Symmetry: D2
Subunit: 115 residues, 4 copies
């Protein structure tokens, strides 16, 4: 998998399960084309989100539905969504891991880029 | 000021100065209307970024040009941009400070919301 | 004020008020000795924590009592405490701000140095 | 593996490899008794740091030598060390992962605790 995620819940100290996310690719005209959507499992990850064939070089946006994550827990969050925008160069089997630490009024997005 | 920012540089241990940002407002049709731009001073802040007349209830987007900040610093950044997206005055009018902690491959967005 | 703090609460999006902390100095022995205490006001700050005379060059440990903070909020924390250890050089009116972002199972420590 | 770590480098976007750490166990008198040391591999993890028998309920301290890490990376760090202190109830196959995100002037410590 060239694009992976790892979401953690900073209130309970567990992975963030059942977070919905969408992957969008920026096109020539500057617009965004949705190319995939998924939901984290109980470990805060998604497997088989997009193939290397679906993941050419270019700018991508990954939108995490963090508001619903907190609302379904009875907490009231600040952010509508968490969006991670980055220029990708999957070359030489270069893989990207988007880590995300969630609190109701704050989140941290970091990237682990390999090969 | 109803909308303040406070950007810090986690590499240098200083406020992030001269960071450019845009403030947008979600519209009825689901698009975005830009309402302001700004650039942080040397304390990492923008004074009088918007006024109360520009700030009715609704969803807003604050887009920080973090990639240009790290390029001018000589570092190579991951993120194309840093986006904070939130519903303003959902339960009534409030004031907002957006705290942002910047590293080349990571950032933390936090909100301080007061009456 | 050569040593300042700013503590935020990431659960409810406010400063963290009434957080107790201890400032310790490292001894030439190798251990710690407590030189001051304080408690954050409603803005997550402590004014007049220590003086420039109490804050000479040297290694310092600031120990934030985050466990008691989350207990008094009704939450279960992970950390027994939040410690920040750094080498201070207040040379040339150089001031330190320890920014601290608190969640029950996580905290971020960062420093702003003039 | 009841006590695991995961360290990342927020500047380069890689795991922080070759970080030294010391595991200490609070004693009845309040002192600390070192019980283990380790160094992260290239994934930012340490495997078989301590056994479940070495890890009874109690207060533990994990000290990460982040000053040496940043110096070797060519950056001047703020912190002398990163210290994670916590009360552990490892009853019923409860595992602790100490997650650590590092920048020269900032770090974030989080914990992931598995269920019994
Ligand atoms: O612990 C984290 C982590 C990240 C990537 C990964 O492959 C495994 C992890 O445990 C982690 C998650 C979110 C964050 O903001 C920082 C982290 O170190
Ligand atoms: O110290 C911070 C801060 C936040 C709000 C404010 O009005 C002033 C501050 O110094 C701060 C804390 C966490 C963070 O991710 C970014 C910050 O600027």
């Amino acid at each position: 998998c060239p694009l992976m995620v790892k979401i953690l819940d900073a209130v309970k100290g567990t992975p963030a399960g059942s977070v919905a996310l969408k992957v969008s690719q920026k096109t020539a005209d500057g617009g965004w084309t949705q190319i995939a959507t998924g939901v984290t499992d109980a470990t805060g990850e998604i497997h088989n989100l997009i193939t290397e064939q679906q993941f050419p070089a270019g700018v991508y946006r990954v939108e995490f539905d963090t508001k619903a994550y907190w609302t379904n827990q009875g907490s009231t969050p600040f952010h509508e969504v968490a969006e991670v925008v980055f220029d990708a160069h999957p070359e030489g089997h270069r893989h990207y891991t988007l880590a995300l630490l969630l609190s109701p009024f704050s989140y941290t997005t970091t990237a682990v880029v390999s090969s």
